[PDB]
Amino acid sequence: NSILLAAVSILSACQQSYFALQVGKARLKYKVTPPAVTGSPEFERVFRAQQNCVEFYPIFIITLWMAGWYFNQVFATCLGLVYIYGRHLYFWGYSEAAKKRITGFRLSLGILALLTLLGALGIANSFLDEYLDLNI
Amino acid sequence: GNSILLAAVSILSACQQSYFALQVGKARLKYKVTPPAVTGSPEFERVFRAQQNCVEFYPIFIITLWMAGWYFNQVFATCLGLVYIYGRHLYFWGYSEAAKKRITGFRLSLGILALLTLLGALGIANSFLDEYLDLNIAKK
Amino acid sequence: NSILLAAVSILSACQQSYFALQVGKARLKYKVTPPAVTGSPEFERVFRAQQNCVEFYPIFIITLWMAGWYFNQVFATCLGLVYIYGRHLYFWGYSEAAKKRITGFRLSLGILALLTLLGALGIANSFLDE
Ligand SMILES: N[C@@H](CCC(=O)N[C@@H](CS(=O)(=O)O)C(=O)NCC(=O)O)C(=O)O
Ligand SMILES: N[C@@H](CCC(=O)N[C@@H](CS(=O)(=O)O)C(=O)NCC(=O)O)C(=O)O
Ligand SMILES: N[C@@H](CCC(=O)N[C@@H](CS(=O)(=O)O)C(=O)NCC(=O)O)C(=O)O
C-alpha cells in the first residue's frame, strides 16, 4: 500500500545523487579541489544549488510520506513528481545564473507547502477516526 | 494508524525547518547577501550557520524519533520530540543574536536526541530478543 | 519485520552524531570559533568530511529501507553495515589527507548505487503482483 511512495522516493534519491555527481564534475572543470567550497562563480552556483536540495530533501520525504499515508497515496505521488521537476528547474536554472533559480524554487516550495497541508489534514482526519468521526 | 503522534511531530518539525529557511532568506535581504554567497555579515553568518546546524541534525532526529517511537513507546518519543523542537527554537534564535548564546539550545536538542537514541536502541534490542530468545521483564 | 533495518539505522545515526562530535572537537584543537567554517587545512577537511556524510545520509536511509522492505531485509542490512564501514574509511581518511578519502567514498557510493538498484527491482517486482 506504499508502492507508489517508494517509487517516487527512489527517483527523488537518484535526482539527489545525479545533482551530487554534477558538483563533483564542476570540481574538475573549475579546479576546486577539496576541502574547498569556493573559487569559481560557476562552481559556487552548482554547489549551493544542490546544497539547497539537500537541506530541503528530508522535509520533502517526511511531507511526501505523511500526505501519502494519511491522505491519499496517488495525489501525493503526483505532487511528488511535480516537486522532482521543480528541483530539476531549480538546480539547472541556478547552475546557469543565480537569478534563473526562482521559478524552480517557487514551485518546489509550493508543492512542499501543499504536501504539508494535505499531510496535516490527513493526520487530523485520522485523529478523529481514532476518537469518533471519519469525514466522507 | 499506530504512528499518528509521530506523524504529527514530524510535520511540525518540518515546518520549523521551513520557517528557519525562510528566516535565512529574510536575512539575505536585510544584510544584502545575494546568492551564491554565504558570508558578508557577522549577523548573516550566524543566522546561516544556525539552520545549517539544524539541517545536518534533522535526519538524525527523524530516524531516532521514529525508531524510539515504533520500538519503545510512541507517546514518550512524541513528547521528547516536542522538547527537541523547542530546544532548536532556542538554538536558532540564540545563535542568531550571538554565537555564545546558542549553547542552552544546543545542549537541550543534544540531550533529547541522545535520549531518543537510547530508548530506540533499547526498544530495537528488546524486540530483537523477542524474535529469537524472549526479552520481556514484566514481573511487577 | 523491520528489526534489522531499525538496528542499522540507529547505528548509522550514531556514526553521524560521532562524526559531528569530531568536528566540534576540531573547533577546539584548531581554534575555529563559530560562525567560522574555515581557518585551518586540518579543520576544513574534518568539516567537509561530515558535511559529505550529512548530504548522502537521507539518500542512504531511503535506499536502505526501500531495498530492505521491497527486496530482502537481510541483504540490505549487510550492505547497510558495509556502507557504515565505508563512511568510517571516508571520514577518517579525509580527516588525515583529502586524497586518502577516495577508497572510503568509492565503496559507500558502490553500496548506495547497489541498494538503489535492489530497491528499484524489489519495487518493480511487487508492481507486477500489486
Ligand atoms: N556534493 C559534493 C560533491 C559530490 C561528492 O560527493 N563528491 C565527493 C567525491 S569527489 O568530489 O572527490 O569526486 C567528495 O569527495 N566530496 C567533496 C567534499 O564535499 O568534501 C560536495 O559537497 O563537493
Ligand atoms: N537556506 C537557504 C535560504 C533559504 C532558501 O532556500 N533560499 C533560496 C531562495 S532565496 O532566499 O535565495 O530567494 C536559495 O536559493 N537560497 C540560496 C542558496 O541556498 O544558495 C540558504 O542556505 O541560503
Ligand atoms: N557539525 C558542527 C560541529 C558540531 C556542532 O554541532 N557544533 C555546534 C556546537 S559547538 O561545536 O560550538 O559546541 C555549533 O555551534 N555548530 C554550528 C556551525 O556549524 O556553525 C559544525 O558544522 O561545525
Side-chain angles (χ1 to χ4, degrees), chain A residues 2-3 6-7 9-10 13-14 16-17 20 34-35 37 47 50-51 54 57 61 65 69, chain C residues 41 44-45 48 55-56 58-59 62-63 66 69-70 94 98 101 116 120 123 126-127 130:
Chain A
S2 300
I3 297 124
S9 305
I10 67 171
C14 288
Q16 274 289 121
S17 309
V37 290
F47 174 75
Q50 99 155 2
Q51 281 289 292
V54 164
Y57 188 67
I61 292 301
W65 285 74
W69 283 340
Chain C
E44 278 161 61
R45 284 196 306 271
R48 269 323 305 164
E55 55 198 73
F56 274 106
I59 289 153
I62 277 52
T63 53
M66 287 328 102
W69 285 341
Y70 292 77
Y94 206 148
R101 80 203 180 275
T116 311
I123 289 160
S126 60
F127 188 97
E130 292 140 21

Side-chain angles (χ1 to χ4, degrees), chain C residues 27-84:
Chain C
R27 292 179 155 286
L28 277 95
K29 192 170 290 247
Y30 307 106
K31 314 255 162 181
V32 177
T33 46
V37 289
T38 60
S40 173
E42 287 83 41
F43 175 67
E44 278 161 61
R45 284 196 306 271
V46 179
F47 174 76
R48 269 323 305 164
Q50 81 147 339
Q51 286 313 92
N52 196 264
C53 305
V54 164
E55 55 198 73
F56 274 106
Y57 188 66
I59 289 153
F60 159 65
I61 291 298
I62 277 52
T63 53
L64 170 76
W65 286 76
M66 287 328 102
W69 285 341
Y70 292 77
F71 188 90
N72 180 280
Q73 187 183 194
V74 192
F75 211 59
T77 287
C78 296
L79 289 173
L81 276 330
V82 185
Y83 174 78
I84 295 187

Side-chain angles (χ1 to χ4, degrees), chain A residues 44-45 47-49 51-52 55-56 87 90 94 98 101-102 105 109, chain B residues 20-26 28 33 35-38 44 48 51-52 55:
Chain A
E44 277 161 60
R45 285 198 303 274
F47 174 75
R48 278 314 306 166
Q51 281 289 292
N52 197 264
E55 54 201 72
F56 272 67
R87 284 287 164 189
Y90 181 77
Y94 203 162
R101 80 203 181 274
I102 304 298
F105 183 68
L109 200 90
Chain B
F20 287 153
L22 165 86
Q23 292 311 314
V24 175
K26 287 180 72 99
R28 292 175 99 73
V33 180
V38 292
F44 177 73
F48 175 75
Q51 75 135 352
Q52 282 295 83
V55 165

Side-chain angles (χ1 to χ4, degrees), chain B residues 11-132 136:
Chain B
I11 276 285
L12 174 62
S13 78
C15 289
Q16 202 182 23
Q17 278 296 119
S18 312
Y19 170 69
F20 287 153
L22 165 86
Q23 292 311 314
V24 175
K26 287 180 72 99
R28 292 175 99 73
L29 289 165
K30 188 169 258 157
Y31 307 104
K32 309 207 48 70
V33 180
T34 304
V38 292
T39 60
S41 172
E43 288 81 42
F44 177 73
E45 278 162 59
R46 285 198 302 272
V47 179
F48 175 75
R49 269 326 304 163
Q51 75 135 352
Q52 282 295 83
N53 198 263
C54 303
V55 165
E56 55 200 70
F57 272 66
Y58 187 65
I60 286 46
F61 160 66
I62 292 298
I63 276 300
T64 53
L65 172 75
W66 286 73
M67 286 325 102
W70 285 341
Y71 291 94
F72 190 90
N73 179 280
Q74 190 180 13
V75 192
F76 306 151
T78 287
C79 298
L80 291 172
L82 295 180
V83 184
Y84 172 78
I85 292 186
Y86 179 72
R88 283 289 163 184
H89 212 249
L90 276 60
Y91 180 76
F92 178 87
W93 286 113
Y95 201 165
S96 286
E97 179 221 39
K100 287 142 197 203
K101 269 294 162 157
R102 79 205 179 272
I103 295 299
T104 304
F106 182 68
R107 279 173 155 199
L108 178 61
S109 314
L110 208 82
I112 293 297
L113 252 174
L115 186 61
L116 246 51
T117 313
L118 163 78
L119 285 178
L122 282 159
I124 289 159
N126 216 310
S127 299
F128 192 84
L129 305 188
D130 205 36
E131 183 76 70
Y132 309 75
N136 292 335

Side-chain angles (χ1 to χ4, degrees), chain A residues 7-80:
Chain A
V8 166
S9 305
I10 67 171
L11 246 171
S12 78
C14 288
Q15 203 183 19
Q16 274 289 121
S17 309
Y18 170 70
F19 290 155
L21 165 88
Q22 292 310 315
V23 173
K25 287 181 67 176
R27 292 177 152 289
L28 287 164
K29 192 173 294 254
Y30 306 106
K31 311 169 185 290
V32 178
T33 46
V37 290
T38 59
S40 173
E42 288 82 41
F43 175 75
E44 277 161 60
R45 285 198 303 274
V46 53
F47 174 75
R48 278 314 306 166
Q50 99 155 2
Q51 281 289 292
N52 197 264
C53 306
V54 164
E55 54 201 72
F56 272 67
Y57 188 67
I59 288 153
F60 161 64
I61 292 301
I62 285 157
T63 55
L64 170 75
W65 285 74
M66 287 326 104
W69 283 340
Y70 291 97
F71 186 93
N72 185 284
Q73 189 183 9
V74 195
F75 215 65
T77 288
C78 299
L79 290 172

